[PDB]
Amino acid sequence: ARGPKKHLKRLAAPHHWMLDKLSGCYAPRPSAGPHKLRESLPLIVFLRNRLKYALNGREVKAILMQRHVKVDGKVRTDTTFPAGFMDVITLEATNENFRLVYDVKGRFAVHRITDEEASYKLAKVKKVQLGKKGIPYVVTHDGRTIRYPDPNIKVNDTVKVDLATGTITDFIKFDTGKLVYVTGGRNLGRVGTIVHRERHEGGFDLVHIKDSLENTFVTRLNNVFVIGEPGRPWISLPKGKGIKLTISEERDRRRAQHGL
Amino acid sequence: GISRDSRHKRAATGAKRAQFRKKRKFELGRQAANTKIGTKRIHPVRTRGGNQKFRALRIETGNFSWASEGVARKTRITGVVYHPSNNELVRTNTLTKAAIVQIDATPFRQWYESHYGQSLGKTSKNTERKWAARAAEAKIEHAVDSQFGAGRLYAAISSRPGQSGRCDGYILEGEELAFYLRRLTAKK
Amino acid sequence: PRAPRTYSKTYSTPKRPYESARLDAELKLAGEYGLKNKREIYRISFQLSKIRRAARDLLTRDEKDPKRLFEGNALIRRLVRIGVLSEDKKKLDYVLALKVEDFLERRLQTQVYKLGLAKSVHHAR
Amino acid sequence: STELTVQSERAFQKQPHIFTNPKAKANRKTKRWYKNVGLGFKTPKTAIEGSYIDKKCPFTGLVSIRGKILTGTVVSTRMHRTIVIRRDYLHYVPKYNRYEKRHKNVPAHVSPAFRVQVGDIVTVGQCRPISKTVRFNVLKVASATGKANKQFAKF
RNA sequence: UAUCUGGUUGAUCCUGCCAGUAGUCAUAUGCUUGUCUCAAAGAUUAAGCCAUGCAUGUCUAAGUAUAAGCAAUUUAUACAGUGAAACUGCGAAUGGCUCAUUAAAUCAGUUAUCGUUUAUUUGAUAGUUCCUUUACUACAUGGAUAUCUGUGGUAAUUCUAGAGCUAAUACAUGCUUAAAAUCUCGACCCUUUGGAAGAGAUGUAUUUAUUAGAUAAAAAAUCAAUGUCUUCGGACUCCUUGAUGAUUCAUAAUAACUUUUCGAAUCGCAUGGCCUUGUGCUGGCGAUGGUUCAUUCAAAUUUCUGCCCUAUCAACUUUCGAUGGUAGGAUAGUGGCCUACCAUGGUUUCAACGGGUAACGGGGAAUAAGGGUUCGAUUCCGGAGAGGGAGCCUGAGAAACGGCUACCA
RNA sequence: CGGUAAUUCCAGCUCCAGUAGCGUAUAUUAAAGUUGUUGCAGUUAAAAAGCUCGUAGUUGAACUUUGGGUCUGGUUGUCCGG
RNA sequence: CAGGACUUUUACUUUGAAAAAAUUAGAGUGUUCAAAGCAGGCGAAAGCUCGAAUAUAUUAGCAUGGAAUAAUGGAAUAGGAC
């Protein structure tokens, strides 16, 4: 009905916002940005509901204004700016750097990171095409277009963007026996190896993934994000190395590592 | 206004559908331009998402392509002789797409002369040399040649003049041209 | 248009109102544990029933099957914590045999009475 | 379907932007454009060699096969260049723990590269809307001859 | 959490109902009513009618202040502190409400856009505007118009006439700009192995052509064109090409076209670096803008499958498009969406079509052995509508009603 | 039930039930194996078409690689807690 | 693996992928209890730290394992297979 929608009801929000059912009718709708609405994570949520540096929206706004938050080197001032997967959130005071990565369960984890890694962003390849004047460009599944790419970078390949300038420093080819991260579905937040790649030339390629504990699962190709060569990831993965325990196992862990 | 909705239609079964929702602006369709010949007059229309289509009510000139030779020239359109959809259009002189029209042809003739030097109906040294290098390539379909003699070439419009404002096409060649001629003859 | 608040009816009335023996039993129970209403008793019964439903379901699933192993175990643990099940009977099969008295003999009422501090249940209440 | 003639109506029917230069004379004399649809399907020799036209052919025209690929038996050939496909299936009624036999007719477009009789089983591919009801285009006709080899009983 | 009990008889066993019993985010209502927490609430009938008030406006160092505003005081003799108004920009298409319509419609899950539009967003990105090249706006072009000041009209309204000034990121115009490479033309010489001095054109967007957008492997003979090195027998060697399941795709190239789109005459704070010692040439961080391609928020359609009663609805659709074809028109684009010519189809006892709904669809709710039955106006998601019907303006987006135009009430 | 001993009316006293709640009305679900797929009935209680043919529908005899052997992974009971 | 070359076609069943959140079932957690909520918990009580799980929905589409059951197809003018 008539043009774009501008609000978001609290229940209609992505569940991995971890937003509480009460204390409001509305949720912070991610503005038009680099990442998809449902796959994003607004700055407000990151600030208030994760790190707890702000108490309310006004506080968040104030924080933003003094030009201190930095999403991928660039500044940002939107409360509802949609930082998503692999995005580096740097705070100038505190000197903390964060990379937005998922965890074993599904939601965005607070993952503290060093300045040596915070310099670069890792990004999947969505499209490879020749643009105007015959100039080749690559499209990252995370927002960007990069002109004149290395011509053996194809779709689904992951790319090390140096972020400070925005040039491709290095890349990983999508292939069997390469460390992978799942970014959508039930298996989202899981880390694996790629055992096999089914095709079905028509609709949705399925990739078979084994983790470190020899525990195979299948996801769609567009949910699968390459991260390195097995055992050696290009980024630091969060605590619990994207592993997925069974519920009982988790409970046991909780019990046996008690230290109140 | 004229709407392109499939709401007002009957279903596959022949069932008359009930009137759900009043007609929308995204369903809309505007009046026919039905362009005439003589003195250039082009009205812009604001479409969806900004953008302009150009209604070409009254057009005189047009640039037409000789696909064999590989050249196109701006030329006067003088009359619609045949239109596949409707004889009414022909009667009117309504310039549309796929209509068959008569072109001034003089520019084409001039071009030909410049190129080969052979002329249709009956200097420097470099030019002569060039001509020599060419030749025998200058033969053409007989029908075209005949037309040239009269001074008016048959061409088909391939632009949608109601959409672009631009009125453009291709000079009639080969089998298609022959077919068109036959059709014309039949009509007479 | 704010997110709806969840209610839950926490008791269930009997399916037959004047079952005389049942009524007398209820009365006796009330007398024993200084209960203001039959409502309290009903609440307890409802609670018991919920537990039973869970337990039965668990039983219906194969033993050593994950869900049974987990949820059932958790339930058992909870029961032991509350003090309704005894350490002899961490079994899930024993969960079905519980009966209303064990819940009433665990209220801050009865407990208060049974540690001194009172002289009868009413006083404690 | 076409059925004879080719150059049969008010307008000259040609493949758009296919040019057959009437100066340097070729082997085919008129150039024919075709493409393979993909998905493992094969472009027939009737399509490549033929003289017919069609914008709505998946091989020689402008439509592109994408999305759903269905199969079913042919019910009606009667309307020109198109077909009707019956598509029998079982609808599960959960209360009675049993199945209803159901129907649904799919109107589909028939490229003149095919010989289609009533009763032939046909593989049909989804494409861009073609008419009021048609969304589908015939890709493969499975009933090849029936019993056109030995029709007469005499050994 | 698998339960029944009273009533047909003089008594009996049944069939059968009626009556009881229990629940209802199920309404009403009758009596009562101390406390704590939680909290539905003009849906049902009349999508009946509406007094009065409010519900959408908005300004930052950073578009435009000569308020004849306030300042007032130790950046102004161009401005420079705040700042009403007004212009410009943006928003008012979200939200909120309601369920009247609506039964293959909506809607749900599922596809598709190789079938399109998309403000904003985040990435991208444009030496080519010139047009002959011995004296030219670019150290910056033009005319308006608001507020304001004054003169009024009317019983009246968020009615605006007349005059006088005055702004722009409003509205119009319109400059720089190389080097190279490539494509159109040849003052001549010297009888071939021919080969060139120098002159014009080339951005993008637009339009129609046309061409390229290759790729299953190796080895020839020679006939027409006839190149390059000749160590004058002759060799010929290293000879481009992205993506998809798939394209006439991406993209490039030649042809021209065009009542020639865009290519910064815009703002704030910084006041840094070389002296050819000019006030010269320079240079930092930003705002707004602007091209196409991205992307993001979206968008129209779209695939397959699924709706409640009814045969006291069995044939329905096709003059006035029904089903299909062809061409055009129209549209953001696909399509009988519409028009012309043609064909006679399309749906149906596996209920078409018609009728009803005290029908918005779904998530769900009540009940609660298992299976079911009934409900879902209503907090979330879709969809409709703003008394009824039309029709449109502005805009990225509305067939908008706290926009306009009409008719009916 | 009530026509002169009314345990049924109207009151008084006792008592029972639920209890800050309880009653009445109309729906609706369970009770209903009184809608039946699970799961009902049809000689006499309601109900077998007067009878046969018959398109759709539903349904429809049996029959094609069974048997052995050879190693080889597990997964719980056991045989001790090594 | 990466490419042909064509594969009788189903129904059924399997595991997987999808069936928004709330609701439902359910793990954790002394809202003083509870309905709830997604909180909290532990310190030197200088800072540290678990959390915010899981499971369901079978109609339709998609993916794969199975080949009993039920159907369909092939060589009888052989124009059949190598």
Add this chain to the structure above:
RNA sequence: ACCCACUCGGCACCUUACGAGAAAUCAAAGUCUUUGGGUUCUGGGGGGAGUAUGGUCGCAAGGCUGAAACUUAAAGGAAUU
């Protein structure tokens, strides 16, 4: 043609039910709470009523199809003294 013995198909009948059933009774009315061989039709308390109405078929009588309002605590079945 009888007579005996066996055998398929038929109209029935007699005695027992170990099965059914409310019972009368039933070799099916059995192989049904130990509930599923395949199928078509019909019933859902008694009246109103095989009525009203609309179809349709009949020359007509009529047939097939077939309600509701309202009404009512029983109408019935088999057996008993």
Add this chain to the structure above:
RNA sequence: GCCCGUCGCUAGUACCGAUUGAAUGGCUUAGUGAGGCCUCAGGAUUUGCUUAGAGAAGGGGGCAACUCCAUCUCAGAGCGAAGAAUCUGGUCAAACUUGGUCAUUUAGAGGAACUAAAAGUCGUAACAAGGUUUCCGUAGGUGAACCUGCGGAAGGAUCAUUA
């Protein structure tokens, strides 16, 4: 004992129905048709360019085509560009006049019902062989149960007459 129908009485439901009845809505024949949008014109007015002659007191840096200046500025007139009212055809199409039609309602002179209340009237049809055994189909007849043909059924008062 039980018990059936006619005619009575009192209520209450529904049914048919003369009324050329009434009302509302949905389609619709013929004819009209607001308003926008598009389009053919129209051209109030609004300006720009022509060197188109001025009075102007350096109307371009000293009598003079000003050592003539977007000079003083109107008759020009030609050439544009913008453009309101109005206007020709369309197109979408609310609506309106007279009819017709379907649906649902609604007055309704009269008529024919059924139920309820079952101390009215006439019989006694059925239940016993109910005093003519009951039923059923059908046809005729009657004051009313009903009676009487023709065919059938025991739910009959008969499971019965060998040879």
